[PDB]
Design a binder for this molecule. Structure first.
Ligand SMILES: [Cl-]
Length: 293
């Protein structure tokens, strides 16, 4: 599994701030927009993009405050990310897209799709955010960790002062061991502790046990949309998974229209780090039949 990031930097000025993005592939078709989550960046897609780029443009932004993007001193609520990504997409003049989404990138992507359904030709998703209505529906192994993350004292100590999301949660949610070169790519945006604000606000935004109410309602709305949308869907899942365990992936295969599921084998949350070649090759194989209108 490759550790390098052989992608030239692109930047666009959005809402006073620069966002970095990968942009490769032909420009005369429907682009594939790759959206990472917490605490990652476009680096997460580095071994998936090469499968798709031969046939399609690949656009992979770094969310504001993350990756190589600028670091405004925001609260980094979900709504901040929505504003920046909405503006990013318009700045690039994107019309129709295919989405490839993960974690908070999936909340952003599904929220954008709900609001722009005529512009989404397909959604490839994995380990995505839906409401977690009670703490018992959160995976046991990660429950006391995320309960501690979601506090103003201990959560800030762990995530901001001690970098626990990068040094702890990220590698704990990859089955194979991450190498130190890979870890240094993930560490680089966050070398200075104060810059870790988005890494703390994100778990505090997760729709768990009814809280925060605004996000629970938003996420319920895009999931209602998704369950009734004919849009083609491609859902990758692993065992045991984290947000989408095997039995829930199977339920989604049945409850989501025009949904193809792909078993990637062992996986927790960052499935792209356990089996990027199957994810990339299956996305590439799925794109052509989405073209026709
Ligand atoms: Cl999170």
């Amino acid at each position: 599994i490759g550790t390098g990031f052989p992608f030239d930097p692109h930047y666009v000025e959005v809402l006073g701030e620069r966002m970095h993005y990968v942009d490769v592939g032909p420009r005369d078709g429907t682009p594939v927009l790759f959206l990472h989550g917490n605490p990652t960046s476009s680096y997460l897609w580095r071994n998936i993009i090469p499968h798709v780029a031969p046939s399609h443009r690949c656009i992979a932004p770094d969310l504001i405050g993350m990756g190589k993007s600028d670091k405004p001193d925001l609260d980094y609520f979900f709504d901040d990310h929505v504003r920046y990504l909405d503006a990013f997409i318009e700045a690039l003049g994107l019309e129709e897209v295919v989405l490839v989404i993960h974690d908070w990138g999936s909340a952003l992507g599904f929220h954008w799709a709900k609001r722009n359904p005529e512009r989404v030709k397909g959604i490839a998703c994995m380990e995505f955010i839906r409401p977690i209505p009670t703490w018992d529906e959160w995976p046991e192994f990660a429950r006391e960790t995320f309960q501690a993350f979601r506090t103003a004292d201990v959560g800030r100590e762990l995530i901001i002062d001690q970098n626990a999301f990068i040094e702890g949660a990220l590698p704990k949610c990859v089955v194979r061991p991450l190498t130190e070169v890979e870890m240094d790519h993930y560490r680089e945006p966050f070398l200075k502790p104060v810059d870790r604000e988005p890494l703390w606000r994100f778990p505090n935004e997760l729709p768990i046990a009814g809280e925060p109410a605004n996000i629970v309602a938003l996420v319920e709305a895009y999931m209602n949309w998704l369950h009734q949308s004919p849009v083609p869907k491609l859902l990758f899942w692993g065992t045991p998974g984290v947000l989408i365990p095997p039995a829930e992936a199977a339920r989604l295969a049945e409850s989501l229209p025009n949904c193809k599921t792909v078993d990637i084998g062992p996986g927790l949350h960052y499935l792209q780090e356990d089996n990027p070649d199957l994810i990339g090759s299956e996305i590439a194989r799925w794109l052509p039949a989405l073209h026709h209108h």
